[PDB]
Amino acid sequence: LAPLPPHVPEHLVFDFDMYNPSNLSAGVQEAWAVLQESNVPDLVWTRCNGGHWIATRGQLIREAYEDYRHFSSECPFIPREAGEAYDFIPTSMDPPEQRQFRALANQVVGMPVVDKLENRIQELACSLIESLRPQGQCNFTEDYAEPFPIRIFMLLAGLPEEDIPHLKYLTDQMTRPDGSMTFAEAKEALYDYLIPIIEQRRQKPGTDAISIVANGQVNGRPITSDEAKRMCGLLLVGGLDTVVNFLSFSMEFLAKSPEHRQELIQRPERIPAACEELLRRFSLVADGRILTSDYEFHGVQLKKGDQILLPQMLSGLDERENACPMHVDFSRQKVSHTTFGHGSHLCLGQHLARREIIVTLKEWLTRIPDFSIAPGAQIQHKSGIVSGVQALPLVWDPATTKAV
Ligand code: HEM
Ligand SMILES: CC1(C)[C@@H]2CC[C@@]1(C)C(=O)C2
Ligand SMILES: [K+]
């Protein structure tokens, strides 16, 4: 708890801690939605994590993500020193300047590249699921959620699988620090890892993601080694944490909900619609922006330099955006969310994520149609810049499964 700044009023203080929320034991999204109770203002100030604003409603979150003249991406993380050290590209930049770099990032993770990776993403998911199928049980986080997305990103990036444990450790410190590393120390470690590779790939350009970034042009002039490093690093973080945690949330839910399992087994063409409704319900990111000047937003005076968390998770959980928001409805008519962000920084890896998510649902449900949480397990969630699931022990009877 940091001492309250002169310009912030007493009645908007809502001491929420985003790395360790109060009702976390009930589920991390539920823990965040305490911010949407009837008794909580649209925009509150928490004194936790150095102090910062928290917009709690989707109307405010979208407007702040659209207004980059006031809410800048230059310091997008909380606590302030992580936000200051944060210099990844394209995310730490605002438009107009941001735009050249994003186009280049889009060339290595976009839709055309999801199309090239189609065969491998399918192969690997079938493969891992087939391997687990006869055991009748798995540790989902470790046995699928991590290895499926991660090995596809290491593949794209042309990096050896033996590097996963180091890299995933650093990525987790940047999003759910355990205390052992500052955001800045984690980031430097990641750049240290990428420096030589970028240089090798500048000499002998290849087909992999690092080569493509590193030998790229940003609106016609050559990227520097420095800028390639700051783009590559973002890419690794993006490919090593969000899909991984997202898959666990979705599989935890299906494990507790036989009727939803039955719906996709009966009607698999509903899987894309169900993925979007799961991305709404089990949204997991929350980063934010910094004020470029004094500004009055929805009746609250914001001070130049003030940080504001704009939880991308909160927009589709808001009852004002979706009726009965904690309810999963695959037939939901207008699935509204900001799970993949909003404004000029819209997730560039969202096509790759949706493909991994849909392939996982289809291929898991095809081979292991029936499965549940292990008896006696209480699933724990974790909060931070990206929220996630600590471990997910699943069981099933092999006699009900099929090799495909
Ligand atoms: C469920 C999975 C994912 C979710 C929920 C998600 C969400 C987001 C969000 C909320 C942002 C914007 C943050 C901000 O405005 O500060 C973002 C940006 C971005 N994401 Fe994702 N993401 C996911 C997967 C991925 C993947 C798999 C990649 C591939 C490496 C990726 C790469 C990026 C990049 C490069 C940006 C930066 C866009 C810019 O700053 O212009 N993401 N993502
Ligand atoms: C908030 C994010 C998901 C988005 C991509 C990776 C991430 C952690 C950032 O650093 C940008
Ligand atoms: K910064």
From Swiss-Prot:
Main location: cytoplasm
InterPro entries from the UniProt entry: Cyt_P450 (IPR001128), Cyt_P450_B (IPR002397), Cyt_P450_CS (IPR017972), Cyt_P450_sf (IPR036396)
Alphabetized GO MF terms: camphor 5-monooxygenase activity; heme binding; iron ion binding
Pfam families: p450
Gene3D superfamilies: Cytochrome P450
Highest taxon of the lineage: Bacteria
Compartment list: Cytoplasm
The reaction(s) this protein catalyses: 2 reduced [2Fe-2S]-[putidaredoxin] + (1R,4R)-camphor + O2 + 2 H(+) = (1R,4R,5R)-5-hydroxycamphor + 2 oxidized [2Fe-2S]-[putidaredoxin] + H2O
GO cellular component entries: cytoplasm
Tagged with keyword Metal-binding: yes
Metabolic or biological pathway, per its Swiss-Prot or TrEMBL entry: Terpene metabolism; (R)-camphor degradation
EC id: 1.14.15.1
Keywords: Cytoplasm, Heme, Iron, Metal-binding, Monooxygenase, Oxidoreductase
UniProt: heme binding residues: 347
Requisite cofactors: heme
Any GO BP: (+)-camphor catabolic process
Family: Belongs to the cytochrome P450 family.
Function noted in UniProt: Involved in a camphor oxidation system.
Protein known as: Camphor 5-monooxygenase
